[PDB]
Structures are given as structure tokens and as C-alpha cells.
Amino acid sequence: SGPTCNTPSNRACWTNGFDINTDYEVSTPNTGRTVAYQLTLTEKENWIGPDGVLKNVVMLVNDKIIGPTIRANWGDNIEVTVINNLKTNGTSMHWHGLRQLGNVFNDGANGVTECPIPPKGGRKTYKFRATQYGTSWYHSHFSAQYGNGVVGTIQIDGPASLPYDIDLGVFPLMDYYYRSADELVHFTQSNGAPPSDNVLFNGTARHPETGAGQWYNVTLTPGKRHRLRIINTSTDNHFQVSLVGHNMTVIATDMVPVNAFTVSSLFLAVGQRYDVTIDANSPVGNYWFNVTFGDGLCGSSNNKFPAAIFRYQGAPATLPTDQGLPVPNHMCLDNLNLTPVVTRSAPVNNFVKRPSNTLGVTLDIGGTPLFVWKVNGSAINVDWGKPILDYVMSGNTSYPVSDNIVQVDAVDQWTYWLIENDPTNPIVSLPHPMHLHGHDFLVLGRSPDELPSAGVRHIFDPAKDLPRLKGNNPVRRDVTMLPAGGWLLLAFKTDNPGAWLFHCHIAWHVSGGLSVDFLERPNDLRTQLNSNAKRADRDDFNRVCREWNAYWPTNPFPKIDSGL
Ligand SMILES: *[C@@H]1O[C@H](CO)[C@@H](O[C@@H]2O[C@H](CO)[C@@H](O[C@@H]3O[C@H](CO[C@H]4O[C@H](CO)[C@@H](O)[C@H](O)[C@@H]4O)[C@@H](O)[C@H](O[C@H]4O[C@H](CO)[C@@H](O)[C@H](O)[C@@H]4O[C@H]4O[C@H](CO)[C@@H](O)[C@H](O)[C@@H]4O)[C@@H]3O)[C@H](O)[C@H]2NC(C)=O)[C@H](O)[C@H]1NC(C)=O
Ligand SMILES: *[C@@H]1O[C@H](CO)[C@@H](O[C@@H]2O[C@H](CO)[C@@H](O)[C@H](O)[C@H]2NC(C)=O)[C@H](O)[C@H]1NC(C)=O
Ligand SMILES: *[C@@H]1O[C@H](CO)[C@@H](O[C@@H]2O[C@H](CO)[C@@H](O)[C@H](O)[C@H]2NC(C)=O)[C@H](O)[C@H]1NC(C)=O
Ligand SMILES: *[C@@H]1O[C@H](CO)[C@@H](O)[C@H](O)[C@H]1NC(C)=O
Ligand SMILES: *[C@@H]1O[C@H](CO)[C@@H](O)[C@H](O)[C@H]1NC(C)=O
Ligand SMILES: *[C@@H]1O[C@H](CO)[C@@H](O)[C@H](O)[C@H]1NC(C)=O
Ligand SMILES: [Cu+2]
Ligand SMILES: [Cu+2]
Ligand SMILES: [Cu+2]
Ligand SMILES: [Cu+2]
């Protein structure tokens, strides 16, 4: 079962009984369809990458620099077989943005919900249900491994908040370094974040100097409205994108459909995606799709003009001749003035800051490593052998301190968290793209918009900010900007007993230790993981752990970072 009333003119209707107004967190289309995918990870040394430049190593999903798309319809069940044929590295496949409702075992977080799949052809078949529709991506959680090429896309078909004719498809944008993920982890352990060596466009790159590589083409059909699925799968860079000659109508933020909001330029934090509509009401010519940067505290590239080519049907095979206008500095901040079509509502008029709901982000500049990120006084450092689920599926509640477990006992109530971005640090404060596993959150509010490099600090003040907090259907998504030198307020509803990572999606920072682990409804969760139903999941879990704990001691390399 796919659509039965989903047409160019009526995108809001999907099938009888489901549409763009249907609360997807309650009613899910029962389609008796399952879809299977296979993903095979290989490793390649001394390889020639997208832009002709030698890469000392890369790790590829299905022999390409970018993994395939996991496609399916809202409601279908999904089984994805990850085969790890890497030489030495373990792996954890995470399905970013998936709610994993009551399905923690398949989240894909090593040391948290699973043991890493061993190299040399060890595997696991991840099973899960599409209880959402929209655009996302998947990627390794095994250290910074995805920055080596272990990344890919998701696209579950569903309704839309705005009609359109063509659906171009996913459009992954991802920063590109000639250095390897492990060299960059080692580099940033005592150096600031480097710029990218290039930007990829849906799995392609063109070199600034040698003019090698190639421009990526997107074709437009004069007049017809198109839908573009933009993903930022980077490890660091936050992209400002724009299309010369055209505006872009937002109709989805992350896995959440939203009321049509048109923009001229759009800011993409790491992990964020947006679904824009593009009306091709322009002259049959060629138009730059530009990548630009704001404050360098959230990225830059050695490629000063990365772009792709959007071409009208009938247009020649020339290049765009209009270099476009100047793009405004989005100051390392994603826009919040977006209205979800399915509405939510939390009380905000009652928020009172205290230890039990406040997460303090800090950078310990000490020694070995020089740069270390900590939350609430602790750097997270999971154990690839003994995952939190283990402590849960047994009586042991003696979790290690470095697992930074934040327990939440509230049963299906709203829960408020104020993240503070190192406010007493006079020397530095960086923007962080915060991501929650297992939930979408409402973005209740954040400190006043600032230019990061101006160093303007903001601590939470009840007298100024409570009037600015929004509890009546804010933006809700899985990624949002913690402001530089500021603070962010968030809420999710503990409706999914599990252990959920809450971390920074900058590979360098989360390797540095910038994460906590929400142990949500441990009582309910244990009963779940142990129930008859889960036998096949718990047994697989237990199985992949056995082969990893056995392999581990044969590994020639140590664990250099937190593991995440
Ligand atoms: C980034 O790079 C990737 C490549 O990795 C590229 O992805 C390619 O994306 C496109 C668009 O997302 C994919 O094209 C579509 O495939 C679906 C489903 O395919 C399945 O079914 C067919 C049936 O034989 C099988 O062959 C196939 O193997 C799959 O099982 C189709 O449904 C799509 O066709 C629809 O849209 C087309 C126009 O885009 C129409 O020609 C076609 O008639 C269909 O339109 C219909 O659907 C509408 C509903 O919305 C309906 O209202 C209309 O009336 C009509 O019924 C299309 O073929 C492609 O498979 C991807 N994979 C590749 C090529 O590797 C991205 O495109 C790229 N990103 C950008 C932006 O460049
Ligand atoms: C969008 O990208 C295009 C192509 O990369 C940019 O075109 C360049 O413009 C700069 C201006 O300094 C020139 O130095 C380059 O020679 C141009 N390259 C080409 C191929 O023409 C364009 O500048 C970009 N537009 C925006 C808004 O950033
Ligand atoms: C995962 O694979 C990569 C490639 O082997 C490992 O990175 C190498 O590891 C050593 C020891 O840490 C480094 O000194 C080298 O710089 C790395 N090689 C390159 C070219 O990047 C990494 O250590 C492996 N992780 C595991 C699971 O051991
Ligand atoms: C885009 O078109 C150019 C020339 O028209 C071609 O060289 C290039 O390979 C194309 N890009 C893709 C995605 O193949
Ligand atoms: C894009 O929007 C801006 C203002 O939002 C306006 O200047 C411009 O005319 C618009 N262009 C098109 C083609 O929609
Ligand atoms: C931060 O740590 C303090 C003291 O260890 C603890 O009381 C509090 O619960 C922590 N805050 C959060 C958000 O867990
Ligand atoms: Cu992710
Ligand atoms: Cu995630
Ligand atoms: Cu960070
Ligand atoms: Cu994560």
C-alpha cells in the first residue's frame, strides 16, 4: 500500500484515512509491506576521490563515495543488512531522525544499544518500522567513521504541506576533507576545527584548481514546481545554500512537515535537512546552486565557491553566467519561525532553572588531549563491549560515570532541559548543533541572536527570557543550534522507554566527549527488552556483542576518542 490520493494538485492527501494533518506519532498506516536493503562496507587505501585528489583511505557504502537511499512508504517495515567488510574498524549504523518507537535495539549506537559489528565480514540485519515520513540520512556511530564515507540517505514517501509536480529526490550535501577521519580526530584533539577541502554535491565533487572532478547537474521543467530534499551530512561545516534566480519554499524541517515558508537563502546545521519547493518560473538558462558560509566558527572551505548547476530543460550545456547576489550571514543559527502542521503544546510559563534540568557544556583545556568537551563536568566515553542496554537487561544500575547517564522517570510527561554553552569561559565558546536520539524536541527558546565571533555572552535570565520562550507549537525537529556563548531550552515527551544519546553532531566534538545519555523509563524499558516479543532482538544484540568482544583483542589499533 502506497498512496491512493497523492497527486500533483493534492499532495496533502495520501490515502483515505491519512494525510498531512494526521498525527504521525499516533496513527500509522498498516501496510503489509516489508522492504529489505543490503549495505556492504569496503575499505580502500590510496584511492582517487571525487575531485581527483588522492585519499589515503576511505570507507564506502556499496562501492560508491555515498551510500544508496533507503526508500519506502510511510508505514512499511524495513530490514537493512549491514555487512562490515572493513579491514579493522567496527561499525554502528545509525538511522538519523528515526523515532525508533519502542525499538531501541535497532537505533544503532555502539556502547549504548549495540556492540559494534566486527570487521572481516561480520554483519547484522537492522529491523525497524517507518512511523514517519520525510527526508533523513543514515551514518556510522563508530567514532568519526562516517566522515570516511560511511554515510547515506533515507526517504520515506508520505503527504506534503504544499502541492508540486516533480520530486527531484534527495540532495545530500557534505563537507569533504583529503585527510582521514582518524587523522582529523587526532588533529582536533589539540587544534581548532579545520576548513573542509571541498564540498560534495549528491556524491560528487569538482576541484577548484585542476578544474577536475565535475559539476553536478539538476534539471528543471519550465513552470512545474519541484521538491528538493536537502541534507547536510557533514562532520563539521554548516551550510548556507541558495539558488541564483530563485527562492525556495520550505515545507519540511527534518522529519516534520511545516507550513509553507519561502526563503531566499537557507542555513543547514550538521544533521539537519529541509524539504523545499522550487517553482521554475525563470528564463531557460543556467543557475548556480551556491554553497556559502557565515561566521567561520561553524565552518569554512578551502573551496571558496562550491556549487552545482541547475539547468532548465532545453538549456545548453554551458555554465551559469550570473554569479548571483551576496548571501546574508546566518550567523551560525538556524531559523525558528517555522510552524509544524501537526501542532504541539508545552507549558513554558512555569520553567525554573535548577541542577536536575540543566546540562552544562564545557571545554576542558588541560592536557592530553588539549581539547576535551564535557557535559555537566564529565566527558562521555562509552564501552564498545558493555552497552548500557546490558546494565538495563540485568539488575546492574551501577552505570559508569563516563556514560553520563541522565535518568528520567517521568511517565509520558513533557520534560524540560536547559543547555548552557560554557558561559564562564572568557576565552572561547563555540556553536554546537545538538541532536536527540529517539525523540523530536520542541525548541522552546534560545538566547538572543548574535554574531558568534563578537563573543557576546548570554546567561539564562527568568526576567527577560520567559516572555520570549514559546510553548504554543514551536519548531520541532531532531537537530537545532545551541548558540555560541549562549543557552538553549528544549523539551521532549518521555514516551519511548530507552537509552537516548543527546550530543553534538560535530564529529570532532562528540569524539571529544560532548554527549549525555538519557536513560528514559528504565523500569518500563527493562520489561520491554526482556519480554518474549524482543527475544530475536535481544538475542541478536547479545550475539553481535559476543563476536565483537572476541575480535577486539586482535585489533591492532586503540580507541582514541569517546567512541561516539
Ligand atoms: C541524488 O542522487 C541520487 C542517485 O543516488 C538520485 O536519486 C534518484 O532519485 C530519483 C528521484 O528521487 C529516483 O527516481 C524515482 O524512482 C521512483 C521509485 O523507483 C522505484 O520504482 C521503479 C518502478 O520501475 C523501479 O524502476 C525502481 O527501481 C524503484 O523500485 C519513481 O516513483 C520515480 O518516478 C516518479 O517520478 C518521476 C519523476 O521524477 C516520474 O517520471 C514517474 O512517473 C513517477 O512520477 C509519479 O509519481 C508521482 C507521485 O509523487 C505522481 O503524482 C505522478 O503522477 C507519477 O505517478 C522516479 O523514477 C531514482 O530512482 C533515484 N535513484 C537513482 C537514480 O540512483 C537523486 O535524484 C539525486 N538528487 C538530485 C536532486 O539530483
Ligand atoms: C556561485 O558559484 C559560482 C561558481 O563557482 C561562483 O562563480 C565565481 O565567482 C567568483 C567571484 O569571485 C569568481 O572568482 C569565480 O571565477 C567564479 N567561478 C565561475 C565558475 O564562474 C559564484 O561566485 C557563486 N555565487 C555566490 C553567491 O557565491
Ligand atoms: C579504524 O580504522 C582506521 C584505519 O586503520 C584506524 O586509523 C589508523 O589508526 C592508527 C592508530 O590509531 C592511527 O595512528 C592512523 O593514523 C590511522 N590510519 C589512518 C590512515 O587514518 C583506526 O585506528 C581504526 N579504529 C579501530 C577500531 O581500531
Ligand atoms: C553535468 O553535465 C556536465 C556537462 O554537461 C557533465 O560533464 C557532468 O558529468 C554532468 N554531471 C553529472 C552528474 O554527470
Ligand atoms: C524572492 O523573494 C524576495 C523577497 O522574499 C524577492 O526579493 C524576490 O522577488 C523573490 N523572487 C522570486 C522569483 O520569487
Ligand atoms: C549535573 O550534575 C549534578 C551534580 O553531579 C547533578 O545533581 C545534576 O543532576 C546534573 N544535571 C543534569 C542535567 O543531570
Ligand atoms: Cu546523525
Ligand atoms: Cu540520531
Ligand atoms: Cu560541538
Ligand atoms: Cu548520534
Residue 214 in contact with ligand 4 by CB distance below 6 A:
yes
CB contact set of 243 (below 8 Å; sequence gap of 6+): 278, 287, 288, 289, 290, 310
For residues 382 and 397, state if they share a domain: yes
Longest dimension (CA), the chain: 68
Last residue of a domain, one of 342, 372, 394: 342
Answer for the pair 442, 346: CB distance below 8 angstroms, yes or no. yes
For residues 347 and 330, state if they share a domain: no
For residues 237 and 253, state if they share a domain: yes
| Atom 7 of ligand 3, residue of closest alpha carbon | 182
Query: How many whole angstroms from 459 Cα to the centroid of ligand 4?
Result: 50
**Could you give the strand order of the β-sheet that contains 239-243, starting from the edge strand earlier in sequence?**
217-220, 307-312, 286-292, 239-243, 265-268
For residues 134 and 183, state if they share a domain: no
Instruction: Extract the runs of DSSP E, i.e. beta strands, from 24-103.
Output: 34-48, 54-61, 69-73, 77-84, 93-96
Nearest to 388 by CA among 500, 495, 492: 500
Nearest to 193 by CA among 143, 242, 163, 234: 234
Answer for the pair 292, 300: CB distance below 8 angstroms, yes or no. no
For residues 3 and 79, state if they share a domain: yes
| Residues preceding gaps in the chain (C to N > 2.5 Å) | none
Sign of dihedral through CA atoms 545, 549, 551, 555?
A: positive
Query: Around Cβ 376, how many Cβ atoms within 10 Å?
Result: 14
Sign of dihedral through CA atoms 376, 514, 451, 347?
A: negative
CA distance 122 to 221: 45
CA distance 65 to 45: 13
Alpha carbon 78 to its chain centroid, in Å, reads 20
| Atom 8 of ligand 3, residue of closest alpha carbon | 182
Task: Encode 362-431 in three state secondary structure.
Answer: EEEECCCCCEEEEECCECCCCCCCCCHHHHHCCCCCCCCHHHCEEEECCCCCEEEEEEEECCCCCCCCCC
| Atom 9 of ligand 3, residue of closest alpha carbon | 557
Residue 556 per-residue DSSP state: S
Q: Which atom of ligand 5 is nearest to the CA of 246?
A: 13
Helix ranges, 41-162 (H): none
Question: Grid coordinates in use for 101?
Answer: 518507537
Last residue of a domain, one of 342, 361, 376: 342
Domain total in the chain: 3
For residues 202 and 300, state if they share a domain: yes
CA distance 256 to 253: 5
| Atom 12 of ligand 3, residue of closest alpha carbon | 557
| Atom 25 of ligand 3, residue of closest alpha carbon | 89
**Domain carrying residue 26:** 1-159
For residues 305 and 366, state if they share a domain: no
Question: Grid coordinates in use for 88?
Answer: 579493522
Residue that the C-alpha cell 520525510 belongs to: 134
Query: Around Cβ 551, how many Cβ atoms within 10 Å?
Result: 18
Query: Around Cβ 214, how many Cβ atoms within 10 Å?
Result: 15
Answer for the pair 262, 250: CB distance below 8 angstroms, yes or no. yes
For residues 231 and 353, state if they share a domain: no
CA distance 444 to 417: 10
Half-sphere exposure of 439 (CA within 13 A, CB side): 27
Query: How many whole angstroms from 324 Cα to the centroid of ligand 2?
Result: 8
Pocket test for ligand 2, best of 305, 310, 318, 329 (most atoms within 8 A of CB): 305
Nearest to 417 by CA among 358, 339, 353: 358
For residues 20 and 105, state if they share a domain: yes
Residue type, 351: F
Pocket test for ligand 4, best of 214, 219, 312 (most atoms within 8 A of CB): 214
Last residue of a domain, one of 109, 130, 159: 159
Q: Which atom of ligand 6 is nearest to the CA of 359?
A: 13
For residues 429 and 284, state if they share a domain: no
Residue 317 has phi, psi (to 5 degrees) of: -95, 40
CA distance 48 to 28: 45
For residues 28 and 132, state if they share a domain: yes
Residue 356 in contact with ligand 6 by CB distance below 6 A:
yes
Q: Which atom of ligand 1 is nearest to the CA of 157?
A: 50
Report the DSSP pairing between strands 239-243 and 265-268.
Answer: antiparallel
Peptide bond into 369 cis (omega under 30): yes
**Which residues have CB under 6 Å of ligand 5?**
247, 264
Answer for the pair 272, 172: CB distance below 8 angstroms, yes or no. no
Residue 215 in contact with ligand 4 by CB distance below 6 A:
yes
For residues 177 and 215, state if they share a domain: yes
Query: How many whole angstroms from 110 Cα to the centroid of ligand 10?
Result: 10
For residue 24, give Cα distances in angstroms to 127, 227, 561: 19, 21, 37
Residue 288 per-residue DSSP state: E
CA distance 196 to 484: 21
Nearest bound ligand to the CA of residue 553: 3
CA distance 140 to 123: 14
CATH of the domain at 295: 2.60.40.420
User: Which protein residues have their CB within 5 A of the ion that is ligand 10?
Assistant: 501
Sign of dihedral through CA atoms 42, 46, 48, 49?
A: positive
For residue 228, give Cα distances in angstroms to 135, 367, 499: 10, 45, 33
Nearest bound ligand to the CA of residue 70: 1
